Protein: Putative racemase
Organism: Streptomyces coelicolor A3(2)
Amino acid sequence: LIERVRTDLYRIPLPTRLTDSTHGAMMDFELITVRIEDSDGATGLGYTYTVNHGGAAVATMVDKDLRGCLLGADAEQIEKIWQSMWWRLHYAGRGGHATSAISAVDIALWDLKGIRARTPLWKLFGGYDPVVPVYAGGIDLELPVADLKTQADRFLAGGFRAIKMKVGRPDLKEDVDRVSALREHLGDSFPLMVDANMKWTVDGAIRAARALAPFDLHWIEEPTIPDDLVGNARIVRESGHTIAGGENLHTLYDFHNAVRAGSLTLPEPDVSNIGGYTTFRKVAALAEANNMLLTSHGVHDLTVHALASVPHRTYMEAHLHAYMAEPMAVTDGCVSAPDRPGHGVVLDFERLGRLAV
Amino acid sequence: LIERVRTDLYRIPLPTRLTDSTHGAMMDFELITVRIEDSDGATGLGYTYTVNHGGAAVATMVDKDLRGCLLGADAEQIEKIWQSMWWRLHYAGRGGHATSAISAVDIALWDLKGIRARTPLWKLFGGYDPVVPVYAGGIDLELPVADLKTQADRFLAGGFRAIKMKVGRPDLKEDVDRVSALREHLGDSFPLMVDANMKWTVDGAIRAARALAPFDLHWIEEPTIPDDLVGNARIVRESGHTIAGGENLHTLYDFHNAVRAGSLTLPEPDVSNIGGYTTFRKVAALAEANNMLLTSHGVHDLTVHALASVPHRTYMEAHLHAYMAEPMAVTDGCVSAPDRPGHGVVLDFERLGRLAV
Amino acid sequence: LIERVRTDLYRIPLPTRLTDSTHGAMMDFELITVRIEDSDGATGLGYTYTVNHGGAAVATMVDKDLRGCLLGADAEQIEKIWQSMWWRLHYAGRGGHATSAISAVDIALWDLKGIRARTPLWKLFGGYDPVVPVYAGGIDLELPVADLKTQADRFLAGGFRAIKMKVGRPDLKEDVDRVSALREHLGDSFPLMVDANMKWTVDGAIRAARALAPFDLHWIEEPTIPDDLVGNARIVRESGHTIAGGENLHTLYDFHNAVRAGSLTLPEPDVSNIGGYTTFRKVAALAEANNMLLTSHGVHDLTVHALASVPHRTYMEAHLHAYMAEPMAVTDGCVSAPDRPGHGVVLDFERLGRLAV
Amino acid sequence: LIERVRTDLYRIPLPTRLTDSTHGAMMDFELITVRIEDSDGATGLGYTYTVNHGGAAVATMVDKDLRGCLLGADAEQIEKIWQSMWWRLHYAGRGGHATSAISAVDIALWDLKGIRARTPLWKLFGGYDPVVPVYAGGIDLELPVADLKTQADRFLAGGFRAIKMKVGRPDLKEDVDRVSALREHLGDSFPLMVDANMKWTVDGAIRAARALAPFDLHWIEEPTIPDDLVGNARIVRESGHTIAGGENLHTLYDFHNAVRAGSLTLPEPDVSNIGGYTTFRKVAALAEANNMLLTSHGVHDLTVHALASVPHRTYMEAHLHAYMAEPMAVTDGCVSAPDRPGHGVVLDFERLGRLAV
Amino acid sequence: LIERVRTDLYRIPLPTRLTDSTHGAMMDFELITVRIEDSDGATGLGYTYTVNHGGAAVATMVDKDLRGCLLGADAEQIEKIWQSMWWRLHYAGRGGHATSAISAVDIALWDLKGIRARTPLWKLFGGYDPVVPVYAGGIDLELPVADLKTQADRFLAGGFRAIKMKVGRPDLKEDVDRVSALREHLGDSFPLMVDANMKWTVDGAIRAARALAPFDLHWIEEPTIPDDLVGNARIVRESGHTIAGGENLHTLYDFHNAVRAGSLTLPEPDVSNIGGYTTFRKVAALAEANNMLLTSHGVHDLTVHALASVPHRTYMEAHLHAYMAEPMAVTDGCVSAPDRPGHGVVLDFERLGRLAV
Ligand SMILES: [Mg+2]
Ligand SMILES: [Mg+2]
Ligand SMILES: [Mg+2]
Ligand SMILES: [Mg+2]
Ligand SMILES: [Mg+2]
């Protein structure tokens, strides 16, 4: 039984003005943490985030809407609780910010079950390989070419052996020069992927694909908006590239629609908005049945457990490490999921209070 | 230019007995009102609502996330404001409660543009016919048959010449009897429609359609969950009934998916969650293009102007009046869009004040 | 209420040299103007046109077939009037010249509603951005290469930063050279588009696309006849170009067919033949739903308000000004929708009087 | 680490000569048990079965082929071990008896992880509801009508509130009489399903569907052979019944093909041949994404844990209970998954030695 | 009538160096031989094999599960025996190793029918051309480039005029160089084919095809896993190569699925796992109907009769001879089906005796 539910909202400012083709200027993201305590004193940690806005909304959803489905409920019945939450925020929801709220709670619940069973999540899930390959995702669209190469250098220095840069400049010519620059800087066999962050039109995306073909990019992420199934399927049929998407899909059905329609070739769910580990693994299954690999977006410290428990995973995005007790370190291109009970992530809530809103 | 944005949340208490198949019992809905004031001092009224939960979150999005797109902006550029609000709440959004927040703002912006043009919105939208036909939607699933008939007479007494009743009782035999009763009670020629509120499985919905076919129901609403395009299309090919849906669809794309796949035969958008008049009208256009009629869900006071401006509308659902000054009356099965500037809705903020949270 | 409807036909003389691939040489277009007056004395201006023939017939439909739906009718119910005119000319109609007649009336009705609301139409439609980007469409197929470049400079001189040229010369080798010349002349970064005016066969259009791909054309317009849904869709899958079309589509259904089949990638409706603003806006909604941009054909003076009210517009074609009072100027590649009540177009009926037939 | 792997084969004779439309005469099924012991003394139990033949083959596969992938391996990495097993028996396998062998081992591995974590599997998986609805499946095709009704009586007496009888007699007339008899014996609202065990041709199956329509059967199982995707999809489109299948599908891909093709409406995997709990949950996810319910075939004492951890489960088949320590009892139509660590199934291996082959 | 059925298992030791992308290193294959004797004393020889594992299980199915369908049965009714063996091993079978067991029996039954008719099988099947063209399939992935060329010359030295090499090295750059080398080495006009053994992902396979296109490979075999119909069909539309597959398909239905979906362009059945000659011929018929050529995998000694009896055969794979009496020789790129009664294969059971397990 759940006896306590603490929801907290923090505004974590960023070290650099990270920027892209649509989200604009990221100067601070909103962190929402959820701590669930059972009748035995154990406390599971869960959390999600937004960029610039929507944070207070998510936190309010957990604190005012979901709480009533948690207090007094058996915390070991996660699937049961998930459905009850899905239905509580269904009216006017069924997607949107409500899924982020749910994801945070869901993550907390699994953390709790992992602690109780005295075993890491990647094992609780079944367990494949705790060593997960990674890549660094820069939010460098406005970063000058030279600064691009520099950042590239630090990523390498930091153990990363695969990099993703932003694209979607007004003039495709500028993207072609920058991508060309890093392909020469990084070298022929270096895994380099791009993310247009929904910036292109269907025709534009395909046009950009022909132009970037020479550089053998590992993949193109979110060429256009995610909602257009027909357009994305067209971009898949015509761009001769791996098409990654999923960070903006928020339900199992969105992934199901995309996969069935073939509007993406590489599923990229975000455990913190897809519905937690619960829905993430379901999406993972969908991918496996469709003979596709599986990558991820955000909170890799939490995500490492999911990918360590699936056989078809590939380069995980591992761009808050300051507030963490023992954050994972990247070695020769990979990370290792810890073996502590649960997900093993511990946040310095004392130092965080400094940033509460 | 916009100089003021006032957001208020109200807990309107709902009588017992209001129940359906999946949401459970309607305790109380939460009204999120948005009043906008521009340089010249005119104010526009817009509002949305939720059943049971999510209200505080809706209000939070407007007051905290959207206000920044309103204050200081030219209120005459509704479309511009619409797109900027869609993008401000896009991360973790792109659907969900955020579209309800957006609708509220949109609706108030149109009201303001109408107030300024000194014309009712139905005329400002184009102008078809201000006399819109209606029906009464009962939230009566757990309502004893006898009472159901009593409710029927009360609706006829109120001027309604079309009635919808809930279905989806655990055992199909119960729905058949109740439906037979009202059919028997109203006479076969009286438009009777049923709402399942997503209660049935695909097979179950098809199985229920065979069972109800004898009664010649005008339509079956939300036979199963809305997310299932394939399943809902199967229900369309096999049930021999008009299939209504759309109250739970929250983007123009959802409607595009549903229509393109033929997963429904009659689009039922809700102006207060679909994106306000702005998006509602774009959905109406899709329905016209596809040779479909157009119905609606909720806040008929605001919606009347929408359907009074499109040629293919049909029975509007018109089940909060105590708080209004000049609520439309139901006469001979129709209502009439008032000709006052804007949508013509006036709320008693004094009496509502007593219910703020 | 409508009390007057004045229909006039004018033979505006067109200079030699204006030529394309299938229509031959532009001798003179025929302007059909419709001025409507209501009870209060306000007048609304609407108009359409044809190239070479059909003018007298267009005028005849309005003056003889439609006047009966106008005189005595409430001019504020545009949508109602629209549907009744569609049906009055439905037998042997349902498309064709009759939609041009209908557009003329529709356009004047909107102008009247704008005049009455004391607001420019772009704001009355919603309001996005009054600064609409443009391009110059040359009717220059038989124009010597040299002259073609001279025409180019004249367009830059006029403020245009995007240019369309005709293609479809009997021998593909001619189109390639000419296109290479202007590409060479304008610089690769300058938006250059080509219009074939339905000249090519399906195979030929695909064959021409391979040939022109080197020049990175912004788009290819009407590669073959518009009636061929299957063929046009094949051109879309195989040509690697943005495919523009719609000037010859005369109903919302035509646009629905084309979009649903993906027989074009960029809808190009003509407000004066598609059904006026009423239908134009419904087509815009289809384009938005399908994640497509929206361009246009003809009478940019009237069209500017349409595209200035939709979020996905793109370069508007803005090639009759001598007869206008305050014609928009082209500045830095854009034009600006005037803020005068209605569409703001004023014609010199004195000077036009000299050309009546 | 796995230190021991014991494979045993038993011929469990049946209490009655159970019979059906294709498998013929079942006088004894082959039980294959697998006991995996780790470096801590814990022992996980896993098992599968065949009917009449194939037993020695499966056992041989575990003992001679899979053992080498088990001895010395970390037993906590189940996903890792599954893939290695899938690949070890891939050549000439990739389906078939190899999946049964793998399922037995897989089940053992999860049992082991459940014991180690001191928690029942239905909870380890996430946990939905330990109370799972059930139905009794008779292998009564040759059973006289009177004996049919009698058996029906014992099932009721035994707590079952849903029954499945065999169909697929040479003359559809005999099936229609028997089904008619039990529908009258059991009553109108009694859940009665049929299983043709692949006996009908596509046309025959559809013909039989029309004939059995009057009796409102809960579902028709395996109308034709499972391999025919096109034919089954046709039976689904035309029989107006829930179509259950899956017991003969042996890989995630088979289920994926069926679901995508719509050749079945209710997935029915058998945890003991699909690949264990590992693949069973993946199939479960596929079903959830496709808005389908989920049922099962065989070994319900093991299966109860899977269905207790999914939200979309329905009537579980719960037709060896003699050799079990504390077999579950059916109460008012449902069973309850035990809370002992692992799956909680304990076999009397001493008494079983009596039946070893 | 059948009076004897002798099943033997042999561990034939395989040299080091034999390696591919997914199976790893070929240690040793397991030969399962089946000798059948009828009333008149004639004996028919049939056999199958596995790589590394599954052998003992194959033998067990024949010896224990199938013998009951052979002894006492009329050996002249091959089709009858075929269907009864398919059904005896259907539970938990319907594919997998069981089809290999069935093939062994089937092959021996045909041999016996040929021995009795005193005619080679190729003539008994119809009779097309006994001179079947061939190619050499190297199991050479980890083989140094230099050695690869050396292997090439050895194949030319052996009479082969077509060569297949393995691909799927972790880094695509390695496959390109090696392929370039052999292309360079053999001359562009020499048929060179590559086998990936299911190593690539759908995107990867398409990416590899672009890379290898310069070399004009005769075909690409098993680009990804065979179970993925959708993915394999995508590889077909996008790779511009002949796509070979079928060695891992174990039923006529698998081939039907693949063909119907166009998930491969060239069917490659293996007579020893597809179901023997009986099923092999039915697969050939599907290939003829679909205007496809037909190739093969494994035991060319037995297969030669199949392809020598069909009109659309192409290069047969002809990489166990030491154990044969009169092994066909490779001359000028072809082999010739012997005209001895049956398949004409004779094994040295003395020398094989030394390898039984
Ligand atoms: Mg991204
Ligand atoms: Mg409803
Ligand atoms: Mg044109
Ligand atoms: Mg069954
Ligand atoms: Mg091969």
In short: The longest strand of chain C covers residues 2-13. The longest helix of chain C spans residues 97-117. Chain C has two domains: 1-118+349-357, 119-348.
